[PDB]
Every structure is written in C-alpha cells, then in structure tokens.
Write an enzyme that holds these catalytic residues in place. Structure first.
Site, PDB file in Angstrom:
ATOM      1  N   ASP A  15       0.734  -1.225   0.000  1.00  0.00           N
ATOM      2  CA  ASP A  15       0.000   0.000   0.000  1.00  0.00           C
ATOM      3  C   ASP A  15       0.792   1.322   0.000  1.00  0.00           C
ATOM      4  O   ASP A  15       0.202   2.345  -0.082  1.00  0.00           O
ATOM      5  CB  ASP A  15      -0.951   0.009   1.175  1.00  0.00           C
ATOM      6  CG  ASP A  15      -2.004  -1.095   1.068  1.00  0.00           C
ATOM      7  OD1 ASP A  15      -2.526  -1.314   0.004  1.00  0.00           O
ATOM      8  OD2 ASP A  15      -2.272  -1.681   2.072  1.00  0.00           O
ATOM      9  N   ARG A  29       0.660   6.734   0.618  1.00  0.00           N
ATOM     10  CA  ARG A  29      -0.237   5.670   0.934  1.00  0.00           C
ATOM     11  C   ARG A  29      -1.305   5.678  -0.155  1.00  0.00           C
ATOM     12  O   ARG A  29      -1.937   6.695  -0.354  1.00  0.00           O
ATOM     13  CB  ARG A  29      -0.894   5.918   2.281  1.00  0.00           C
ATOM     14  CG  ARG A  29      -1.966   4.935   2.691  1.00  0.00           C
ATOM     15  CD  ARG A  29      -1.482   3.481   2.761  1.00  0.00           C
ATOM     16  NE  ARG A  29      -2.357   2.535   3.435  1.00  0.00           N
ATOM     17  CZ  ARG A  29      -3.438   1.964   2.897  1.00  0.00           C
ATOM     18  NH1 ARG A  29      -3.826   2.257   1.676  1.00  0.00           N
ATOM     19  NH2 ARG A  29      -4.139   1.096   3.573  1.00  0.00           N
ATOM     20  N   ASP A  34      -6.614  -1.674   0.786  1.00  0.00           N
ATOM     21  CA  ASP A  34      -6.005  -2.327   1.946  1.00  0.00           C
ATOM     22  C   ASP A  34      -5.434  -3.640   1.405  1.00  0.00           C
ATOM     23  O   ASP A  34      -6.161  -4.484   0.874  1.00  0.00           O
ATOM     24  CB  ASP A  34      -7.056  -2.574   3.047  1.00  0.00           C
ATOM     25  CG  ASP A  34      -6.468  -3.215   4.308  1.00  0.00           C
ATOM     26  OD1 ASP A  34      -5.356  -2.842   4.708  1.00  0.00           O
ATOM     27  OD2 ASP A  34      -7.119  -4.078   4.926  1.00  0.00           O
ATOM     28  N   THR A  35      -4.116  -3.784   1.474  1.00  0.00           N
ATOM     29  CA  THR A  35      -3.485  -4.998   0.992  1.00  0.00           C
ATOM     30  C   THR A  35      -3.191  -5.893   2.196  1.00  0.00           C
ATOM     31  O   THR A  35      -2.926  -5.397   3.282  1.00  0.00           O
ATOM     32  CB  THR A  35      -2.205  -4.648   0.212  1.00  0.00           C
ATOM     33  OG1 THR A  35      -2.538  -3.678  -0.789  1.00  0.00           O
ATOM     34  CG2 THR A  35      -1.588  -5.888  -0.445  1.00  0.00           C
ATOM     35  N   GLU A  37      -1.279  -7.908   4.864  1.00  0.00           N
ATOM     36  CA  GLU A  37       0.076  -7.717   5.378  1.00  0.00           C
ATOM     37  C   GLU A  37       1.008  -8.797   4.843  1.00  0.00           C
ATOM     38  O   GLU A  37       0.556  -9.850   4.391  1.00  0.00           O
ATOM     39  CB  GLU A  37       0.080  -7.689   6.908  1.00  0.00           C
ATOM     40  CG  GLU A  37      -0.709  -6.530   7.492  1.00  0.00           C
ATOM     41  CD  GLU A  37      -0.190  -5.182   7.028  1.00  0.00           C
ATOM     42  OE1 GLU A  37       0.995  -5.096   6.646  1.00  0.00           O
ATOM     43  OE2 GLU A  37      -0.965  -4.202   7.053  1.00  0.00           O
ATOM     44  N   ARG A  75       1.944  10.766   5.421  1.00  0.00           N
ATOM     45  CA  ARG A  75       2.009  10.115   4.115  1.00  0.00           C
ATOM     46  C   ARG A  75       1.090  10.842   3.146  1.00  0.00           C
ATOM     47  O   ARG A  75      -0.026  11.213   3.498  1.00  0.00           O
ATOM     48  CB  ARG A  75       1.561   8.649   4.202  1.00  0.00           C
ATOM     49  CG  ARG A  75       2.382   7.823   5.174  1.00  0.00           C
ATOM     50  CD  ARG A  75       1.938   6.369   5.259  1.00  0.00           C
ATOM     51  NE  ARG A  75       0.565   6.218   5.738  1.00  0.00           N
ATOM     52  CZ  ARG A  75       0.004   5.049   6.033  1.00  0.00           C
ATOM     53  NH1 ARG A  75       0.709   3.925   5.936  1.00  0.00           N
ATOM     54  NH2 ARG A  75      -1.256   5.009   6.457  1.00  0.00           N
TER      55      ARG A  75
HETATM   56  C1  LIG Z   1      -5.703   4.869   3.159  1.00  0.00           C
HETATM   57  C2  LIG Z   1      -5.847   5.790   4.347  1.00  0.00           C
HETATM   58  C3  LIG Z   1      -5.337   5.438   5.555  1.00  0.00           C
HETATM   59  N1  LIG Z   1      -5.469   6.299   6.627  1.00  0.00           N
HETATM   60  C4  LIG Z   1      -4.977   5.944   7.959  1.00  0.00           C
HETATM   61  C5  LIG Z   1      -6.102   5.208   8.721  1.00  0.00           C
HETATM   62  C6  LIG Z   1      -5.386   4.129   9.571  1.00  0.00           C
HETATM   63  O1  LIG Z   1      -5.134   4.692  10.861  1.00  0.00           O
HETATM   64  P1  LIG Z   1      -4.542   3.655  11.947  1.00  0.00           P
HETATM   65  O2  LIG Z   1      -2.936   3.583  11.815  1.00  0.00           O
HETATM   66  O3  LIG Z   1      -4.866   4.348  13.358  1.00  0.00           O
HETATM   67  O4  LIG Z   1      -5.125   2.305  11.816  1.00  0.00           O
HETATM   68  C7  LIG Z   1      -4.069   3.927   8.781  1.00  0.00           C
HETATM   69  C8  LIG Z   1      -3.957   2.582   8.062  1.00  0.00           C
HETATM   70  O5  LIG Z   1      -3.052   2.763   6.959  1.00  0.00           O
HETATM   71  P2  LIG Z   1      -2.322   1.357   6.660  1.00  0.00           P
HETATM   72  O6  LIG Z   1      -3.390   0.345   6.037  1.00  0.00           O
HETATM   73  O7  LIG Z   1      -1.191   1.593   5.730  1.00  0.00           O
HETATM   74  O8  LIG Z   1      -1.688   0.756   8.012  1.00  0.00           O
HETATM   75  O9  LIG Z   1      -3.890   5.024   7.857  1.00  0.00           O
HETATM   76  C9  LIG Z   1      -6.092   7.486   6.479  1.00  0.00           C
HETATM   77  O10 LIG Z   1      -6.192   8.239   7.429  1.00  0.00           O
HETATM   78  N2  LIG Z   1      -6.583   7.865   5.286  1.00  0.00           N
HETATM   79  C10 LIG Z   1      -6.490   7.053   4.209  1.00  0.00           C
HETATM   80  O11 LIG Z   1      -6.963   7.419   3.143  1.00  0.00           O
HETATM   81 CA   LIG Z   2      -2.359  -1.794   4.842  1.00  0.00          CA
END
Ligand SMILES: Cc1cn([C@H]2C[C@H](OP(=O)(O)O)[C@@H](COP(=O)(O)O)O2)c(=O)[nH]c1=O
Ligand SMILES: [Ca+2]
Length: 129
Positions: A15, A29, A34-35, A37, A75
């Site tokens: 991702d 990001r 959501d890929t 892990e 990101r």
């Molecule tokens: C894709 C995306 C993720 N996120 C945040 C939400 C999640 O918060 P949390 O870290 O508290 O779970 C996190 C998950 O990204 P990842 O799937 O890369 O871990 O990134 C956003 O805020 N906006 C987005 O568009």
């Molecule tokens: Ca992810």
C-alpha cells in the site's frame, strides 16, 4: 482530478510507495485500498504485484483527490498511475487488495474500484478463492 509527475524512489510494500514528488522525497499511501500484510495470506504475492507494477513503469504519476492530501502519519494520499494504468485499481482488480478506507472527500474513484473488486470476485481471483 489531475495527474502530476513523480519518480520512484522505493516500492516499499502493498500500500505504500516512496516517490520523488516536486523534487522532494515523499511516502504515499495508496487511496481506497487495503493490501494483506506481508505475513498474511497473499501478502508476498500482493506485495510483488504492486512493487513490480511501479518498478516496471516508464512513467509514474501522482493524482490527489479533492480532500486531504496527507494522512496523520505524514504520508501523501493519492491514486498512483504506472504508464497510465491506475495502481490502486489494478491491485483490487486482480484480487490482491480490497477496497477500504473510503473517506468523505477522497472517494472519486470509489465506484470504479468497487466494480474492479466485484469483477475480481466474480472470478474468486486470488484473495477471493
Ligand atoms: C488509506 C488511508 C489510511 N489512513 C490511515 C487510517 C489508519 O489509521 P490507523 O494507523 O490508526 O489504523 C491507517 C492505516 O493505513 P495502513 O493500512 O497503511 O496501516 O492510515 C487514512 O487516514 N486515510 C487514508 O486514506
Ligand atoms: Ca495496509
């Protein structure tokens, strides 16, 4: 929306990608996905598919949506294109990611991605098998 130039610095994982955008290194990001892990099923498969898509591309492009362009971790949040093919969409289309994290204001390609996931399911493709 509109596409902007960028160059690959490093294909991190499913991702995320590190790119040079506006001459500055930045980690993006991918929006709407959501890929699995690395340590889950299809993780290494999902990861390679993503990495290779950006690494084989001659031209990478960044496309921000209408909402926030950076998440809480700093990101960038965007749709990434590899030689004109959307990476976010391709990943979902081959059953190697699921549509997720659909937030108000950054959902322009939501329906296009959901159609890709529906199409990937019709085939129990990768993660759908
Ligand atoms: C894709 C995306 C993720 N996120 C945040 C939400 C999640 O918060 P949390 O870290 O508290 O779970 C996190 C998950 O990204 P990842 O799937 O890369 O871990 O990134 C956003 O805020 N906006 C987005 O568009
Ligand atoms: Ca992810």
């Amino acid at each position: 929306l509109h596409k902007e130039p960028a160059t690959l610095i490093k294909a991190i994982d499913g991702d995320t990608v590190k790119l040079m955008y506006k001459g500055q290194p930045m980690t993006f990001r991918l929006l709407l996905v959501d890929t699995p892990e690395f340590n889950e099923k299809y993780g290494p498969e999902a990861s390679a598919f993503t990495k290779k898509m950006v690494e084989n591309a001659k031209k990478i492009e960044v496309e921000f949506d209408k909402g926030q362009r950076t998440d809480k971790y700093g990101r960038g949040l965007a749709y990434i294109y590899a030689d004109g093919k959307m990476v976010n969409e391709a990943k979902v289309r081959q059953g190697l990611a699921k549509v997720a994290y659909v937030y108000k204001g950054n959902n322009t390609h939501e329906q296009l991605l959901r159609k890709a996931e529906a199409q990937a399911k019709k085939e129990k493709l990768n993660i759908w098998s």
